[PDB]
Design an enzyme around this catalytic site. Structure first.
Site, PDB file in Angstrom:
ATOM      1  N   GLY A   1       0.694  -1.167  -0.261  1.00 56.09           N
ATOM      2  CA  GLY A   1      -0.125   0.061  -0.070  1.00 56.09           C
ATOM      3  C   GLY A   1       0.957   1.359  -0.034  1.00 56.09           C
ATOM      4  O   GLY A   1       2.038   1.075   0.191  1.00 56.09           O
ATOM      5  N   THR A   2      -0.007   2.273  -0.142  1.00 56.70           N
ATOM      6  CA  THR A   2       0.887   3.842  -0.054  1.00 56.70           C
ATOM      7  C   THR A   2       1.111   4.257   1.273  1.00 56.70           C
ATOM      8  O   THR A   2       0.870   3.674   2.102  1.00 56.70           O
ATOM      9  CB  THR A   2      -0.104   4.633  -0.734  1.00 56.70           C
ATOM     10  OG1 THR A   2      -1.028   5.369   0.292  1.00 56.70           O
ATOM     11  CG2 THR A   2      -0.914   4.292  -2.071  1.00 56.70           C
ATOM     12  N   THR A   3       2.234   5.224   1.259  1.00 54.79           N
ATOM     13  CA  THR A   3       2.650   5.472   2.580  1.00 54.79           C
ATOM     14  C   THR A   3       1.832   6.505   3.372  1.00 54.79           C
ATOM     15  O   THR A   3       1.191   7.347   2.899  1.00 54.79           O
ATOM     16  CB  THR A   3       4.060   6.320   2.273  1.00 54.79           C
ATOM     17  OG1 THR A   3       4.812   5.530   1.641  1.00 54.79           O
ATOM     18  CG2 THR A   3       4.658   6.351   3.686  1.00 54.79           C
TER      19      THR A   3
ATOM     20  N   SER B   1      -2.656   2.038   5.721  1.00 55.09           N
ATOM     21  CA  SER B   1      -2.134   1.583   4.211  1.00 55.09           C
ATOM     22  C   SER B   1      -2.520  -0.059   4.054  1.00 55.09           C
ATOM     23  O   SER B   1      -2.640  -0.782   5.195  1.00 55.09           O
ATOM     24  CB  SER B   1      -0.639   1.623   4.468  1.00 55.09           C
ATOM     25  OG  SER B   1      -0.343   2.982   4.607  1.00 55.09           O
TER      26      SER B   1
ATOM     27  N   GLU C   1      -0.082   9.521   1.369  1.00 58.75           N
ATOM     28  CA  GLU C   1       0.037   9.638   0.014  1.00 58.75           C
ATOM     29  C   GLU C   1      -1.057   9.054  -0.874  1.00 58.75           C
ATOM     30  O   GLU C   1      -1.378   7.876  -0.632  1.00 58.75           O
ATOM     31  CB  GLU C   1       1.524   8.681  -0.233  1.00 58.75           C
ATOM     32  CG  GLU C   1       1.885   8.513  -1.605  1.00 58.75           C
ATOM     33  CD  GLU C   1       2.738   7.555  -2.054  1.00 58.75           C
ATOM     34  OE1 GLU C   1       3.640   7.892  -3.179  1.00 58.75           O
ATOM     35  OE2 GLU C   1       3.071   6.843  -1.019  1.00 58.75           O
TER      36      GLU C   1
END
Ligand SMILES: [Cl-]
Lengths: 231, 243, 244, 250, 240, 241, 235, 111, 195
Positions: B29-31, B74, B46
């Site tokens: 996943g994204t940060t 995330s 993010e």
């Protein structure tokens, strides 16, 4: 492989294959397009028949006077999910005298789809949905994936060869977003969008399905001779 | 073998491989990050811009629980929403019976026990999210991070997602350089910098920054999203540091 | 989920047999032999205890022969614990009938219901069948003396003489040979003991490895008496027929 | 969620064996030796107290348990399984008997109820059988003294004397040479201590041995006076000191 | 509750548990139904590996569902008792609400519906039983014979057989039964039924059961001697 | 071999899921120790905070179950907190139902019974934890009772748990061989805490700062945990002798 | 094994796909829609000559204005028909009117995906639902165990379906008379059937606005069979 | 004891012509001897050219109108936007009312 | 409902039951048969609450007929009466109890004896030489106490019954429109048409 027997199992890289297989059913579905301006939101759908003796499977469903969607994938699953949306819109009206925000409609679909991805015995929904609506914050377009992921967009497309229309709309973004107070032009842009996904077949009168909702327009669907204007 | 095919089964090590597999979904996943400050907490995430067609500012990922707690996560986004929905139910029943809004440690264990419960049976799947959350209660500010196993701790700073290591390194510098404490407005700026620095590990698609905060002095102890002038100021501070 | 560990106890083989029922019958074929013989003036129940130890308390013991009511008894072959579950159900069923109609339950009605319970465990519920075969010996004023058997499938049949458990094939052949219809109880007692003596897997048949019972009209006028034999009485009846 | 295991975990194999019951008996074989001997005026049940650590207080772990004032139990196999069975056994003596008849159940019937509980763990959905064999000693007015063995299957047998667990084969043979139908309770205690020494390896004293009797009524252990018909428990646990007294004249 | 879907589709479109239930029927003792001009006759094989039987008390192969309808079967005996009991209860329930006994078609439709339900319910296996259901509708003299099977399908037959070696006896009936002229009397119908079983049975001793149903609740079971006379007569005409 | 995935018997009469839950016990790589004084019961456990971003005050494996009962856990924190919440709820209910505080040994038995159920019932996994309960019981006095994933429980003169438990166990055995008594013959809990840390240092062969340890103390009518400075005060006292 | 509601890697439900194979083993059923009515015809296919063919019931009335034909595991259809009849009668009780053919069909199709771990498996039967209502006139629907239904001008289901459907593609036009449709069903059934078509092994039916749903006598169908043979010989 | 019913007064009237129909009602709403409102409408357009009034206990009146309006909405959803004829509306309203047979809507209804 | 009587003689049980069905100020019917045949040799008459009576009677009839078909056997009058008693004894503590009083006349073929059972709605069963439910008993019991003998013939029983009906037609306030009389003996159940 060994991890695709049910939704309750993670693969070693952290994937859910049953959810991915459900996503695959959408990819086999007939192309449908969604796009909006600041005053109207428009759905365009290519309908699919079994043969020349059959009817064309309806892709667009009305949820309320201000909301509705188009489908790609398992049609019975779209019927279940649209029925749920109809109830949720209805509850909001009866209890709060309030038109359900298109955003909340998205959150509700996300959470309903999610529960079917964490428990034993169940299966993911096998359909993708494009929800359009006009509420207290203007026109909206949402994309529903049965993974649970719901996304708000200016324009989009799902189904087989949806990438053509999705690229076109990405180019046309600055033009169609400013088609305010002009329904027939916003539809023309959507009909041109879905044309980028056609192969060997072209848009006919019992083939094309268009829906529109907006500032002074209830969610209404056009089929048959009412779409001849746009071919 | 086959120990990894069913949730709640111990391997000969004493491990639950299905949870470890859920952790892989989180790492994909994204940060997202959390910074604890003088009198509150700051959250940032993010948002990968997949296409021009995404409406800016309109796919909100940070979520509020009650009126004083913020949550970001995330991994599998729907799983995170399920956890917040439960969090909201837990917080409502606590406020119903005890009147006072749920304390952050109390709220942390509520999520913890619920996530831990999804490692006890083979008929459920573990959560595919690590969740950073916190707020302000009667004892000041608290920041927490909760993982698929149900494990959680209190944090000075927290990070998860694809750019977690980059973000962690940046967080450790702030803890070392500011032993006395970081201010709420400073932490907002730093959050923007860290998300931009952690974006290097996801740099194909460019992104959209989203920040929120709870501060006893700045937001009156309530959760608020950072918008407009304060957001653009934080974006600019971040843009200056990458060059 | 849990599907992984499901044995599917209630399914058909490709040949149309019920796996678990067949395997339960295989289990029963290792249990001590029990014999029922129906005479014109009564019924004999005889059963062999499973390999005894000298320190077993023989008199205060019950393993094979159980009383259902004053007119009906059963001989057991299989898991005793499974049998007691079913025996208690049968005992209650008998009392339910007596409470409802103010008449003792006809033997077949009791046998059918117990057999119906067994049937259920083979069609629904995903549970293992009862590993038990019964010999029912009883009297009612409709058919007089009756012998029945039921097995894990829930199938039951009526008999003049029958055996369950170990060595039924040899036991049945021997019973088929020496049984005749005008037979009396005391003749049937002898046949039962003679058959067990020849089919036993032990060295010699002794009083401490046997349970014995008769159901006679040998009370006083038109009424039926159940006699579960005491150890010493089995010792005497074994001498009286010259087996020891 | 919810128990999706509504199917049997013990099933018949093609050969006729019930696997889980067999394997439960195997667990009992690994268990520490326990025994029971029936005298004319009492019953003795005994076992070794296998300590898990010398820092553990083995008095806090009781292997011999009172079920009713006239009934006691000991086991071989899995301790935790035994502990919950004792809880259940004590309760069922009340719910299905004392609360109905105003008196405690006779030994054979309490044994019958425990056997039922163990049988159901052999057939019900989503459970394994209990990994224990029980020896239950008791007294009641119309049956006198009795001793029973309950196995993982749910089967129970009455015994004059027997042993279960680790060195049961040798212990049973020892008991066959020594048992007669004229044994007095003190003679049975003596034989119990002799038989146990063969299977015990380390220390053999009143702190490593657990032993209880079913004998005469103990008015001093009743806790009250004034009702002539209430005369006290026949179950008594021998003290660490009482065992050592008998180990000198061994 | 035990929930497992035991009857499911296989890749080729078969439901194996239903099809294996048919194999249990194929193992069962042969049963035959033949309808005449004014009667239906139900004949049943009884295997002779069982001597020392008590025939007074042993469950009979043909069961009365009501005073006017009978049911015979092939397959698992224990399974059939459940179907018979339910049928008998529905028989009394129909008399109670409609104030008229069941038609043979209706009783058959109910029994078949029960069987079908056990093919798409969780936690149950199909019935290892096929049935022959025969009788006469209230105030009607037209003979009725129906057949059901584990899947749940049912149909009417001029004559039919089920069980082991049923394909052999069906062959016999297919060339020996004239649709234009059904056995005009009771004697003719019993004989054609006994003949068809003698193709498969062995000795016509205590191996054959015959039950005759005539209009207006007229059902009787033949004794050994009565059946033996048919056996004796058929063999003497055969030596030709 | 599905007999290794759920809590049914293996051919040799074993329960592998229970055995593997015992191995999960050491996953945290932390050692704990409990001893008894005349008036008190002291439990100590290692505190390892590897990440600099963690708030060290929130990292704990010692729990206050009731006013009188404390519990230290050896095993992963999710299972540890699951056990702690249940223990708290059980102890609270006991008091409401029976009118007096739940004894340490009774709570131990109850938690051991729950653990036993997971070894017999298939849908529930064992918790990968070992629970050490401590108190000064109003009837039995200073008490240590310990539970494991098998559902076993027993009282202790003293005890240790963790990867290097055997070293600490023998160290304690050798002291009680020498002293000839069941406890630490000391008046104040402060010195019993000091004894505990001293004998952990000797057995493990490591030195501790104020943040490498965690201490719980049970006295009559209360169980409490020590602060970093309470432990530092205790570490100074050991060093100056 | 595996879950009953499992997706294949191609995004299809195993059990639904397998039930479609069961339907291909079923006996042929054909429907043709005209402006004068809808005709439903089926192959009876008796397994043995001793079986009385008129007891084979594969064309069924749902209401006066709606009829239905079936193919596949026909025992599975009983509860579908029972539901359809109750749905139709219930709507008339609640609204004092006839229920639309499409609404009926949608109601039946709602049962279809109500399986899983609700019934244990999908239905093994496909339905042809034919009827008339005032809004959309004469209609023919194909209802599948997937929960999907298509409107058809003409449609064949069962073992002879793909061959019969190709024939229906050539023959159907928007001006067919009822008589023309009757003959066309007989002609195409005779083509795909195994045994030789007659009045005993095939059955005709129709639904008209005026007279409603009617199953034809064996005498009436026999004359249409004779009229068909004469017309094919006549050029 | 709590009385779940009240009386809000007012009166209504319906007349039908050859190609039209009227449904009239006063706008006064009362409890006991007090006026709650001089203008509170109780005649409503329910869609599909159906007008409805449920007069008596206004809480029940409003609840019924609300349920019937919702019924018209779902009739469209379930039967391809088909117009709900007045006779079908009448039959539907009977079931709405009779469904509360043992705890009735305290109203006189006219459409 | 109202009048149901029963007399057991040497070889038969005779049941007499009034023919009127009255609701309010109207006699709605004068030919009502207040009886059900439970089995070939067992008859039950009934009186009590409207609806309840026939519903209970037919429910019992269905159960006895079900038993008959299952076992291919006829339950004894004693057994049937005990089943009926238990059903009423259950009913009396239900949410809505059956308010039905019954008489059961049967001929036990195993004993070759007539048997008459009186059972009220509470489930109070007694075997009697003669029985009555409701106000009828207040006239008939004393009359039968005087004229009844245990060895009477069916004809003597019918004359004894005529005496009861005559007394009821003289002293009872309501017009019950005569009785339907039925005889239960070794040959089963038959109706006397001219009474
Ligand atoms: Cl407990």
């Amino acid at each position: 492989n060994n991890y695709d027997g049910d939704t309750v199992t993670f693969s070693p890289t952290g994937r859910l294959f049953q959810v991915e297989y459900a996503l695959e059913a959408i990819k086999q579905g007939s192309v449908t397009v969604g796009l909006r301006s600041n005053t109207h939101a428009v759905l365009v759908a290519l309908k699919r028949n079994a043969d020349e003796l059959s009817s064309y499977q309806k892709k667009i469903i009305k949820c309320d006077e201000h909301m509705g969607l188009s489908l790609a994938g398992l049609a019975p699953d779209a019927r279940v999910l649209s029925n749920y949306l109809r109830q949720q819109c209805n509850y909001s009206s009866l209890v709060f005298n309030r038109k359900l925000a298109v955003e909340r409609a998205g959150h509700l679909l996300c959470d309903k789809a999610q529960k079917n991805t964490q428990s034993y015995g169940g299966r993911p929904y096998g359909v993708g949905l494009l929800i359009i609506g006009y509420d207290k914050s203007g026109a909206h377009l949402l994309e529903f994936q049965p993974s649970g992921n719901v996304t708000e967009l200016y324009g989009t497309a799902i189904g087989a060869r949806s990438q053509g229309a999705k690229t076109y709309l990405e180019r046309t973004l600055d033009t169609f977003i400013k088609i305010d107070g002009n329904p027939d032009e916003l539809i023309k842009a959507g009909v041109e969008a879905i044309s980028q996904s056609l192969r060997d077949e072209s848009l006919t009168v019992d083939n094309l399905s268009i829906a529109i909702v907006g500032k002074d327009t209830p969610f209404t669907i056009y089929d048959g001779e009412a779409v001849a204007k746009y071919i | 073998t086959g120990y990894d095919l069913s949730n709640s089964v111990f391997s000969p090590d004493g491990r639950n491989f299905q949870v470890e597999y859920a952790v892989k979904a989180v790492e994909n996943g994204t940060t997202s990050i959390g910074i604890k400050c003088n009198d509150g907490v700051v959250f940032a995430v993010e948002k990968l811009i997949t296409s021009k067609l995404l409406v800016p500012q309109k796919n909100v990922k940070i979520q509020v629980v009650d009126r004083h707690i913020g949550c970001v996560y995330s991994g599998l986004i729907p799983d995170g929403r399920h956890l917040v929905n439960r969090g909201r139910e837990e917080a409502a029943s606590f406020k119903k019976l005890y009147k006072t809004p749920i304390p952050i440690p109390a709220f942390a264990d509520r999520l913890g026990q619920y996530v831990q419960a999804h490692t006890l049976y083979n008929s459920v799947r573990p959560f595919g999210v690590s969740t950073i959350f916190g707020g302000v209660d009667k004892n000041g500010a608290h920041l927490y991070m909760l993982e698929p196993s149900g494990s959680y701790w209190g944090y000075k700073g927290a990070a998860t997602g694809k750019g977690r290591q980059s973000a962690k390194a940046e967080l450790e510098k702030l803890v070392d350089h500011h032993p006395e404490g970081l201010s709420a407005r400073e932490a907002v700026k730093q959050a923007a910098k860290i998300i931009y620095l952690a974006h290097e590990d996801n740099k194909e698609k460019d992104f959209e920054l989203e920040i929120s905060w709870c501060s006893l002095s700045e937001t009156n102890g309530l959760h608020k999203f950072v918008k407009g002038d304060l957001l653009q100021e934080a974006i600019d501070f971040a843009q200056k540091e990458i060059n | 989920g849990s599907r992984r560990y499901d044995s599917r106890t209630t399914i058909f083989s490709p040949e149309g047999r019920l796996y678990q029922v067949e395997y339960a019958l295989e289990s029963i074929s290792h249990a001590g032999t029990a014999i029922g013989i129906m005479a014109s003036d009564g019924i004999v129940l005889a059963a062999e205890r499973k390999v005894t130890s000298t320190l077993l308390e023989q008199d205060t013991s019950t393993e094979k022969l159980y009383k259902l009511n004053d007119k009906i008894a059963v001989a057991v072959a299989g898991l005793t614990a499974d049998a007691e579950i079913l025996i208690n159900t049968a005992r209650i069923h008998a009392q339910n009938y007596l409470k409802t109609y103010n008449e003792d339950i006809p033997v077949e009605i009791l046998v059918r219901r117990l057999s119906d319970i067994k049937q259920g465990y083979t069609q629904h519920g995903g549970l293992r069948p009862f590993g038990v075969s019964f010999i029912y010996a009883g009297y009612d004023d409709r058919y007089g003396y009756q012998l029945y058997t039921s097995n894990p499938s829930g199938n039951y049949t009526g008999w003049k003489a029958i055996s369950v458990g170990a060595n039924t094939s040899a036991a049945q052949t021997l019973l088929q040979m020496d049984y005749k219809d005008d037979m009396k109880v005391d003749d049937a007692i002898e046949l039962a003991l003679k058959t067990l003596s020849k089919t036993t897997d032990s060295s010699a048949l002794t009083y401490d490895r046997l349970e014995f019972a008769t159901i006679r009209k040998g009370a006083n006028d038109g009424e039926v008496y159940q006699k579960i034999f005491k150890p010493q009485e089995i010792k005497d009846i074994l001498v009286k027929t010259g087996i020891t | 969620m919810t128990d999706r295991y509504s199917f049997s975990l013990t099933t018949f194999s093609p050969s006729g064996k019930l696997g889980q019951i067999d394997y439960a008996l195997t667990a009992v074989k690994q268990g520490v030796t326990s025994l029971g001997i029936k005298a004319t005026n009492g019953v003795v049940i005994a076992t070794e107290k296998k300590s898990s650590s010398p820092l553990a207080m083995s008095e806090t772990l009781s292997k011999v348990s009172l079920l009713t004032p006239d009934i006691g139990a000991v086991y071989s196999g899995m301790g935790p399984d035994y502990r919950v069975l004792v809880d259940k056994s004590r309760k069922v003596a009340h719910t299905s008997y004392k609360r109905i008849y105003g008196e405690y159940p006779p030994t054979k019937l309490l044994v019958s109820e425990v056997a039922k509980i163990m049988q159901e763990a052999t057939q019900s959905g989503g459970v394994r059988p209990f990994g224990v064999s029980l020896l239950i000693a008791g007294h009641d007015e119309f049956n006198g003294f009795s001793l029973y063995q309950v196995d993982p299957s749910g089967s129970y047998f009455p015994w004059k004397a027997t042993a279960i667990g680790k060195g049961s084969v040798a212990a049973k043979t020892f008991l066959e040479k020594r048992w007669n139908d004229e044994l007095e309770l003190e003679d049975a205690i003596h034989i119990a201590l002799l038989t146990l020494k063969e299977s015990v390896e380390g220390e053999f004293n009143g702190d490593t041995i657990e032993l209880a009797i079913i004998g005469d009524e103990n008015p001093d252990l009743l806790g009250y006076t004034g009702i002539p018909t209430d005369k006290g428990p026949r179950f008594r646990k021998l003290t660490s000191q009482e065992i050592n007294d008998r180990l000198e004249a061994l | 509750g035990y929930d497992r879907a035991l009857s499911i589709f296989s890749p080729d479109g078969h439901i194996f548990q239903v099809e294996y239930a048919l194999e249990a029927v194929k193992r069962g003792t042969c049963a035959v139904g033949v309808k005449g001009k004014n009667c239906v006759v139900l004949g049943c094989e009884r295997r002779s590996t069982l001597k020392l039987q008590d025939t007074r008390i042993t469950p009979s192969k043909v069961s009365k569902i009501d005073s006017h309808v009978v049911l015979s079967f092939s397959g698992l005996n224990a399974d059939s008792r459940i179907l018979i009991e339910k049928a008998r209860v529905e028989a009394q329930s129909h008399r109670l609400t409609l104030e008229d006994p069941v038609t043979v078609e209706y009783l058959t439709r109910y029994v078949a519906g029960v069987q079908q339900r056990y093919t798409q319910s969780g936690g149950v296996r199909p019935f290892g039983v096929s049935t022959l259901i025969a009788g006469f509708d209230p105030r009607d003299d037209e003979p009725k014979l129906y057949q059901t099977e584990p899947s749940g399908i049912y149909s009417s037959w001029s004559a039919q057989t089920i069980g082991r070696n049923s394909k052999t006896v069906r062959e016999f009936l297919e060339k020996n039964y004239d649709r234009k002229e059904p056995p005009a009397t009771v004697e003719e119908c019993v004989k054609l039924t006994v003949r068809s079983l003698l193709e498969v049975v062995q000795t016509g001793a205590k191996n054959i059961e015959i039950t005759v149903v005539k209009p207006d609740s007229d059902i009787v079971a033949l004794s050994s001697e009565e059946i033996n006379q048919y056996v004796t007569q058929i063999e003497q005409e055969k030596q030709e | 071999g599905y007999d290794r995935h759920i809590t049914i018997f293996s051919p040799e009469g074993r329960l592998y899921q229970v055995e593997y839950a015992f191995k999960a016990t050491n996953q945290t790589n932390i050692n704990s120790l409990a001893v008894r004084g005349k008036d008190c019961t002291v439990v100590i456990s290692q505190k390892k905070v590897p990440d600099k971003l963690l708030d060290p005050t929130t990292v704990s494996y010692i729990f206050c179950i009731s006013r009188t009962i404390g519990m230290v856990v050896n095993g992963p924190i999710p299972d540890a907190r699951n056990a702690a919440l249940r223990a708290k709820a059980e102890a609270a209910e006991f008091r409401y139902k029976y009118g007096y505080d739940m004894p340490c040994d009774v709570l131990a038995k109850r938690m051991a019974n729950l653990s036993q159920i997971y070894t017999q019932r298939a849908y529930m996994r064992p918790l990968g934890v070992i629970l050490t309960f401590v108190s000064v019981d109003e009837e039995l006095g200073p008490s240590i009772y310990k539970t494991d994933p098998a559902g076993y429980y027993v009282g202790y003169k003293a005890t240790a748990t963790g990867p290097k438990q055997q070293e600490i166990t023998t160290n304690l055995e050798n002291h009680f061989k020498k002293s000839k008594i069941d406890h630490i013959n000391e008046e104040s809990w402060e010195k019993v805490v000091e004894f505990a840390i001293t004998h952990m240092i000797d057995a493990l062969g490591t030195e501790f700062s104020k943040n490498d340890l965690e201490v719980g103390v049970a006295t009559k009518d209360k169980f409490f945990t020590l602060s970093a400075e309470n432990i530092e005060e205790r570490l100074v006292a050991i060093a100056e002798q | 094994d595996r879950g009953v509601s499992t997706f294949s890697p191609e995004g299809r439900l195993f059990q639904v796909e397998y039930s479609l194979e069961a339907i291909k083993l079923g006996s042929t059923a054909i429907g043709i829609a005209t402006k004068e009515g809808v005709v439903l015809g089926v192959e009876k296919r008796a397994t043995s000559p001793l079986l009385e063919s008129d007891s084979i019931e594969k064309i069924v009335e749902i209401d006066r204005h709606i009829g239905c034909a079936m193919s596949g595991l026909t025992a599975d259809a009983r509860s579908m028909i029972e539901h359809a009849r109750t749905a139709a009668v219930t709507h008339n009780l609640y609204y004092d009117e006839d229920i639309n053919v499409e609404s009926l069909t949608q109601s039946v199709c709602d049962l279809a995906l109500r399986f899983g771990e609700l019934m244990s498996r999908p239905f093994g039967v496909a339905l042809l639902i034919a009827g008339h209502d005032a809004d959309d006139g004469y209609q023919l629907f194909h209802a599948e165990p997937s929960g999907t239904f298509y409107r058809y001008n003409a449609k064949a289901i069962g073992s002879g379906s793909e061959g019969a459907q190709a024939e229906l593609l050539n023959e159907w036009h928007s001006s067919l008379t009822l008589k023309e449709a009757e003959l066309l069903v007989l002609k195409i059934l005779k083509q795909v059937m195994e045994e030789k078509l007659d009045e005993n092994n095939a059955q005709l039916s129709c639904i008209t606005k005026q007279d409603g749903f009617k199953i034809y006598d064996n005498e009436k169908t026999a004359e249409l069979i004779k009229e068909l043979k004469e017309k094919e010989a006549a050029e | 004891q709590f009385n779940p019913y009240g009386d809000n007064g007012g009166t209504i009237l319906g007349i039908a012509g050859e190609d039209f129909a009227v449904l009239a009602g006063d706008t006064r709403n009362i409890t006991d001897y007090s006026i709650n409102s001089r203008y509170e409408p109780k005649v409503f357009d329910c869609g599909d050219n159906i007008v409805m009034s449920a007069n008596g206990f206004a809480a029940d009146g409003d609840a019924l109108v609300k349920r019937f309006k919702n019924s018209v909405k779902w009739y469209h959803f379930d039967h391809n936007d088909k117009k709900l004829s007045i006779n079908s509306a009448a039959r539907n309203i009977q079931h709405l009312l009779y469904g509360k047979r043992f705890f009735p809507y305290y109203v006189h209804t006219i459409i | 409902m109202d009048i149901i009587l029963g007399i057991r003689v040497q070889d038969s049980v005779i049941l007499a039951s009034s023919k009127a069905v009255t609701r309010g100020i109207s006699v709605l019917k004068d030919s009502d048969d207040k009886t059900r045949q439970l089995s070939p040799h067992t008859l039950m008459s009934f009186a009590g609450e409207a609806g309840d009576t026939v519903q209970f009677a037919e429910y019992i009839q269905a159960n006895i007929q079900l038993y008959s078909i299952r076992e291919d056997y006829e339950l004894s009058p004693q057994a049937v009466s005990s089943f009926v008693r238990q059903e009423l004894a259950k009913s009396i503590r239900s949410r809505r109890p059956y308010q039905v009083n019954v008489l059961i006349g049967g001929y036990d073929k195993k004993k070759n004896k007539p048997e008459l059972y009186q059972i009220d709605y509470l489930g109070t069963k007694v075997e009697l030489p003669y029985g009555a439910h409701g106000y009828s008993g207040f006239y008939t019991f004393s009359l039968l106490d005087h004229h009844y003998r245990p060895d009477m013939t069916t004809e003597e029983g019918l004359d004894l019954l005529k005496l009861c009906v005559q007394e009821l037609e003289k002293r009872m306030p309501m017009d019950f429109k005569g009785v339907i009389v039925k005889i239960v003996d070794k040959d089963g159940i038959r109706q006397v048409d001219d009474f």
